[PDB]
Curated annotation (Swiss-Prot):
This is Thermolysin. Ca(2+) 3 binds at residues 177, 183, 185, 190. Ca(2+) 1 binds at residues 57, 59, 61. Keywords: Calcium, Hydrolase, Metal-binding, Metalloprotease, Protease, Secreted, Signal, Zinc, Zymogen. The active site is at 143, 231 (proton donor).
């Protein structure tokens, strides 16, 4: 924990070199003291005990294959911290510079990642369905966003409430991806999903139906799986957000896009000032309408475009 701030260099999951903020005290640790109360990255050592051990490195160079997932979890956590601070004036997930902790090499062959109420956790994937999941900046930011949601709206992880929770994570994960600006898109998880299949992703915001997700309230999943479809019905909200930002005509409804920055401002406002644990899609629409009204005014294009976007996905 206590030491002097250093800068190491390493290679991520996709093979790019980057600098990472580390801490030196006998070993060099993945502990970034430059952001809030720190970003801390841990090795779960293929087990499921959390957090595992604060990541220690003898020489401050992180180019081993074992190193790569840790490099990206640490680095992309910094990027995501930077987005929230610079764009939304938010200091870490709780708004009070809480330490951000992530563990990598969780379990063996684990095809997923998550926020467990206290930290981020990333599987290495089985190498067929996924490569290590911290390799996707949209994935890291999706997970950290769950932390932001837990401390703000606190959307319950079930049915419509839980689909909004998910969509907020896909929205901000994407807006983070655009912020770092590498090869950004409106898809989710493309950098780490199915190496060896080109062009696919876990979910699409631009066309949720591409991967079996609803793009209209009329096609909402009403069953029991996936906590009442939280990763499925998120499609409806993802599509609304895509339309607000990028524009389009969808089931005959025309939406004039207002761009990514304003989408982010509206949904961050909604998230932090209007939504509640029990909010449903209709309540989301009104929160987004009030937010856009606060920011741009009653008669703005921005308000009209929020309304059209929700009309287009069948949410009144
Ligand atoms: N993150 C999503 C999809 C991950 C893929 C499931 N192996 C979920 O937990 O449902
Ligand atoms: C894989 C990731 C984006 C998330 N835990 C699901 O969805
Ligand atoms: Ca090393
Ligand atoms: Ca991308
Ligand atoms: Ca993406
Ligand atoms: Ca793929
Ligand atoms: Zn999620």
């Amino acid at each position: 924990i206590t030491g002097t701030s250093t800068v190491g260099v390493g290679r991520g999951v996709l093979g790019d070199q980057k600098n990472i903020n580390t801490t030196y005290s006998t070993y060099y640790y993945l502990q970034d003291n430059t952001r809030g109360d720190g970003i801390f990255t841990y090795d779960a050592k293929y087990r499921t005990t959390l957090p595992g051990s604060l990541w220690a490195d003898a020489d401050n160079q992180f180019f081993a294959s074992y190193d790569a997932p840790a490099v990206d979890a640490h680095y992309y956590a910094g990027v995501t911290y930077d987005y929230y601070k610079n764009v939304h004036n938010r200091l870490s997930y709780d708004g009070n510079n809480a330490a951000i902790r992530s563990s990598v090499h969780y379990s063996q062959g684990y095809n997923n990642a998550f926020w467990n109420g206290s930290e981020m956790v990333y599987g290495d994937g089985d190498g067929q369905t996924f490569i290590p999941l911290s390799g996707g900046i949209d994935v890291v930011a999706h997970e950290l966003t769950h932390a932001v949601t837990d401390y703000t709206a606190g959307l319950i992880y079930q049915n419509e409430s839980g689909a909004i929770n998910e969509a907020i994570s896909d929205i901000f994960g994407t807006l983070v991806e655009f912020y770092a600006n590498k090869n950004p898109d409106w898809e989710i998880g493309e950098d780490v999903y199915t190496p060896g299949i080109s062009g696919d992703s876990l979910r699409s915001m631009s066309d949720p139906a591409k991967y079996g997700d609803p793009d209209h309230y009329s096609k909402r999943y009403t069953g029991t799986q996936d906590n009442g479809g939280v990763h499925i019905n998120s499609g409806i909200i993802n599509k609304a957000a895509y339309l607000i930002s990028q524009g389009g005509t969808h089931y005959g409804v025309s939406v004039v896009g207002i761009g990514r920055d304003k989408l982010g401002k509206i949904f961050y406002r909604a998230l932090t000032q209007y939504l509640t644990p029990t909010s449903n899609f209709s309540q989301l629409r009104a929160a987004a309408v009030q937010s856009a009204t606060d920011l741009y005014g009653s008669t703005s294009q921005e308000v009209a475009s929020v309304k059209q976007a929700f009309d287009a996905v069948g949410v009144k």
